[PDB]
Symmetry: D2
Subunit: 189 residues, 4 copies
């Protein structure tokens, strides 16, 4: 089975790549070159060094993902004005447009798309959430499952072990066929 | 570990008891005596035949639950007259049954899981308010509160198993389960 | 125009009945006989002493409302023991009173407006779930449903109610969040 | 009083501008040069030709608004990567930045900001709402009121809702109004 994971070199993505590599060849898109090397030590992990906003939004797609004709699992773990653009580009537009570019392969595999969800932070997380829900409704008939795993504070969210996010992802994709786990709310203890 | 499950002879309840019995002694409260007998053949399963409204609301407690000093997991899976039936069973019973088990839950720092027409709407929102507010009240007392908001019965048991398997630093406060389409 | 207001003798009720009396005959339900007497002084206001839980729920009706041929505006402003009282009064009564007046509401294409600790959370969400579902059930039958969700001078609530029912021909105001 | 209204030449904008001109001088931003002249025929309306994304986002302010030391009422009424950028720029980033830029004038007047609320359309309407609700919390202590008008499945009726919002009592805020056909 085929998995694509963005933010693969962040704390969460590393744990997500290790989990999915049990039963998927994983395309792990990431920024950190040492983690990427470390990741390629895992069998069936295909590291892709990538500046994701530039590749997804400016160049029309990540070349090394272009040949995939079935994707089973796609996990999106990647002044003020410049700050708005940076956040919205990376947290909302890239998941939407990367999912669109992989759409044919997602339909073909009946895959699962999982999103990991100040004024700018509130807006983009509320944005990402409306994207997820409307996408889900657009694609349910095509066999695509859409899910949001939502970390947040109880205290602050950084105290969530990243492996628990990987487990949340594993729980979502493992759900039986008559089911969609559409949302999982995650908080520190 | 000690688990208390209501609605234990419903489809959901049966699969929840089968799964929780892997690592818990399970006090299974339900209506159907034959399923109760069946469940009792599961190592550790304590069947309690119960009319839950009456015992919990009027009698002030379920008898076979009174000498427990630890509860690690409590799962609530159990027209004017209809309103009274729904609201009594969907809301007050979970509120009141949690209250009565509060000491054993704090002592265990345990987990409370609530499995979520016009009566149907108000009860499900009512259950959701109860849970989120009970979470706030018992946050500092070491009790964790979780909703499963739903479908194949085992998928519910899986969701419960995922909730309580959370590590030492995390909790799963809600899981939405929907039909495929 | 005909109007029915519960908890009409509480702070909000009083102001709601005054404003509504400008263009409505108002049937004002209360238990304060002195405020009820007081209210009756206003033209167009016809007061009704009622033990509303007992009447709506246990006797299936409030007698003095039974004969109305339409209701243009209905406004709902009226421990285990604590669970029962609040749920009875905050949720079941508006559900049941509303059902009981269904034929008058349908006749007028009227407006139903609901004014929205563990108990307090639960009933306030129950009330909101009721209103939304009720809205969907009756949308096709001419009835408009609204909530006022105050999280305040009662006159402000009355103004919120007035703003809702006076809304244009093409528009419904389905919810208004009011804060201190 | 002083009002700033974006999208003044749009169908909503015109009726919001008319209603506000009763008790405000209205800075009415738009691109339509004929409708701007049309509106200029309403006394108390000082129209302002503008490419608002460019001026607010690139240039760091709308010129003809830089003099304002008080603003009472600010009203924001203005499937490809490019579509995403167009919509989110206009509907989210503009309102946050414009509000930020007028933040000194708004604090001085203790004024109110009103936001008038397909994968792109869901994402931006949720974004604006999240923008508005965090903004409100940020500025509550500084005396600014924040309100949303959330249309759903006649422009004058939007103008009326806005009038309802700004006219609220001394002790009361109207934070949100859900509107439907």
């Amino acid at each position: 089975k085929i998995a694509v994971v963005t933010g693969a070199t962040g704390g969460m993505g590393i744990e997500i790549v290790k989990d999915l590599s049990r039963d998927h060849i994983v395309y792990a898109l990431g920024r950190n070159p040492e983690h990427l090397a470390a990741l390629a030590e895992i069998e069936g992990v295909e590291p892709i060094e990538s500046d994701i906003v530039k590749e997804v939004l400016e160049e029309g797609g990540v070349d090394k993902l272009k040949n995939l004709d079935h994707v089973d699992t796609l996990v999106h773990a990647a002044g003020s004005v410049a700050e708005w653009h940076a956040h919205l580009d990376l947290n909302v537009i890239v998941p939407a447009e990367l999912s669109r570019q992989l759409l044919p392969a997602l339909r073909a595999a009946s895959g699962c798309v999982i999103y990991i969800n100040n004024t700018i932070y509130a807006a983009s997380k509320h944005a990402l959430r409306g994207l997820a829900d409307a996408f889900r409704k657009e694609e349910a008939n095509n066999g695509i499952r859409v899910s949001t795993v939502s970390p947040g504070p109880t205290r602050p969210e950084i105290y969530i072990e990243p492996k628990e996010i990987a487990n949340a992802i594993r729980f979502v994709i493992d759900a039986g066929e008559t089911t969609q786990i559409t949302n999982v709310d995650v908080r520190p203890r």
